[PDB]
Amino acid sequence: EPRNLSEWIKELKKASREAVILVEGKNDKKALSKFSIKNVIDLSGKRYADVVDMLEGKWEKVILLFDLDTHGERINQKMKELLSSQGFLVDENFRNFLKKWNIIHIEEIN
Amino acid sequence: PRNLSEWIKELKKASREAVILVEGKNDKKALSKFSIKNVIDLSGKRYADVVDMLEGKWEKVILLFDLDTHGERINQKMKELLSSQGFLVDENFRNFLKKWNIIHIEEI
């Protein structure tokens, strides 16, 4: 749907009122904050189960936004499997959309 | 160490006296192939989980995070945390990789 990064960010912000965004680092969270996207959880420094416990009974959907490099893909797969196993709806549409553009690290949006 | 082979030999020796910290499970697996087993992977753990695992058991920790931006940030974070908690932090092995331009532990 989005034609450019600007529209992608607008759509992500709207979606963030209905689902939590998961990223790897604090800097990824900061980059999103600049675009007024605040409903974000950074994984580094947390057990995977900590994310589950934080979302339980509060959010049903999670938007996965890990980097598009090998490191990010492994984490993406791990969290996708974990969250789905715990009953959460996993949204990969936003991350998959970025695969068509020249970007690897979410931090690049800043 | 004069080369990567000796670096591995020295790291293995040092791993009997200090714990090695890496970012991922795959980095840990890579070291395991060289019979270096005293390694903790950070992904999936709270920074404080590492402190609790080492307290009273190990006094020194060898930092072996990748040299990329992601790795350097984690290296600085763990260096500051571990030192604040009383652990001796060893960056000598990692710095040798910097010298040989070895960015990822999995590359070894």
What was the resolution (in A) of this experimentally determined structure? 1.8
Burial of B35 from C-beta contacts in 10 A (0-12 / 13-18 / 19+): exposed
Contact B107, B24 (CB under 8 A): no
Partner-chain contact B44 A44, CB within 8 Å: no
Q: Which residues contact B91 (CB under 8 A, 6 or more apart)?
A: B63, B75, B79
CA distance B58 to A101: 46
Coil vs helix vs strand at A63: strand
Residue with tokens 């904050």: A33
Coil vs helix vs strand at A33: helix
Partner-chain contact A50 B49, CB within 8 Å: no
Residue with tokens 């509060």: A58
Residue B59 C-alpha, separation from nearest chain A C-alpha, in angstroms: 22
Q: State the Rg of chain A over Cα.
A: 13
Residue A104: CB atoms within 10 A of its CB come to: 12
| Minimum CA–CA partner of A75 in chain B | B43
CA distance A61 to A15: 10
CA distance B3 to B87: 28
CA distance A56 to A53: 5
Residue B70 C-alpha, separation from nearest chain A C-alpha, in angstroms: 8
Six token digits for residue B41: 């992977």
CA distance B66 to B102: 8
Outline where chain A has alpha helix (H): 5-15, 26-33, 48-55, 70-85, 93-98
The torsion defined by the Cα of A13, A87, A29 and B48, in degrees rounded to 10, comes to 160
CA distance B49 to A89: 29
Q: Which among B58, B78, B75 has a CA at the least distance from the CA of B67?
A: B75
Q: Map chain B to HEC letters.
A: CCCHHHHHHHHHHHCCCCEEEECCHHHHHHHHCCCCCCEEECCCCCHHHHHHHHCCCCCEEEECCCCCHHHHHHHHHHHHHHHHCCCEEECHHHHHHHHCCCCCHHHC
> What phi, psi does A64 have (nearest 5°)?
-85, 125
CA distance B92 to B95: 5
Nearest by CB to residue A45, choosing from B23, B24, B46, is: B46
CA distance B25 to B62: 16
Residue A82: CB atoms within 10 A of its CB come to: 15
Q: Going from the N-terminus, what domains does chain B have, and what CATH number goes with each?
A: 1-108 (3.40.1360.10)
Is B73 in the A-facing interface, judged by CB distances under 8 Å?
yes
Could you give the angle at which helices A70-85 and A48-55 cross, rounded to 10 degrees?
50
The letter for the amino acid at B58 is W
Residue A98: CB atoms within 10 A of its CB come to: 19
Chain A / chain B CB contacts < 8 angstroms = 21
Sheet holding A61-64, edge to edge: A40-42, A20-23, A61-64, A89-91
Contact A20, A62 (CB under 8 A): yes
The distance of Cα A62 from the centroid of its chain, to the nearest Å, equals 7
What residues pair up with B10 in beta bridges, in sequence order?
A: none
Partner-chain contact B47 A50, CB within 8 Å: no
